[PDB]
Swiss-Prot record:
It comes from Rattus norvegicus. The chain holds residues 382 to 509 of 684 of the full protein. It is found in: Cytoplasmic vesicle, Secretory vesicle, Synaptic vesicle membrane; Cell projection, Dendritic spine; Postsynaptic cell membrane; Membrane. Signal peptide: none annotated. Transmembrane segments: none annotated. This is Rabphilin-3A. Ubiquitinated. Deubiquitinated by CAND1 to prevent its degradation. Residues 1-123 form the C2 domain. Specifically expressed in brain. Ca(2+) 2 binds at D32, D38, D93, E94, D95. Binds calcium via the C2 domains. The calcium-bound C2 domains mediate interactions with phospholipid bilayers. Plays an essential role in docking and fusion steps of regulated exocytosis. At the presynaptic level, RPH3A is recruited by RAB3A to the synaptic vesicle membrane in a GTP-dependent manner where it modulates synaptic vesicle trafficking and calcium-triggered neurotransmitter release. In the post-synaptic compartment, forms a ternary complex with GRIN2A and DLG4 and regulates NMDA receptor stability. Also plays a role in the exocytosis of arginine vasopressin hormone. It comes from the Eukaryota.
Length: 128
């Protein structure tokens, strides 16, 4: 009951590129009473040396059912990287100031993704 996240992934093998489209979320749980319903999505490629492995979509305002419809790309991703790394995706609420509140997450093991074949997801969020 934290909500669910819908997104599509595509490994463009020939351009060493992992295209992650974050589509929408449904019934995102409100947590903090002082907090805002201004959600965004945070992509983190693990294990990794930070910064360049960390991507973020825009931020929607006053919504529990956000629709980002935004493609975030990781360049320089090789087959060895698809074998090694895992993609952590987490949904955060941003507050009156600039502080973020963690709602939920999910992890996609990149091993499971086949090359050039798109793969659409719709999975419930978690706290791990
Ligand atoms: Ca808060």
């Amino acid at each position: 009951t934290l909500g669910a996240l819908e997104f599509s992934l595509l490994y463009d093998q020939d351009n060493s590129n992992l295209q992650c489209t974050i589509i929408r979320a449904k019934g995102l749980k409100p947590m903090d009473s002082n907090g805002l319903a201004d959600p965004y999505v945070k992509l983190h490629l693990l294990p990794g040396a930070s910064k360049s492995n960390k991507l973020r979509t825009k931020t929607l305002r006053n919504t529990r059912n956000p629709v980002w419809n935004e493609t975030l790309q990781y360049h320089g991703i090789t087959e060895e990287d698809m074998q090694r790394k895992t993609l952590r995706i987490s949904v955060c609420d941003e507050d009156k100031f600039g502080h973020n509140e963690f709602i939920g997450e999910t992890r996609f093991s990149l091993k499971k993704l086949k090359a050039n074949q798109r793969k659409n997801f719709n999975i419930c969020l978690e706290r791990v």
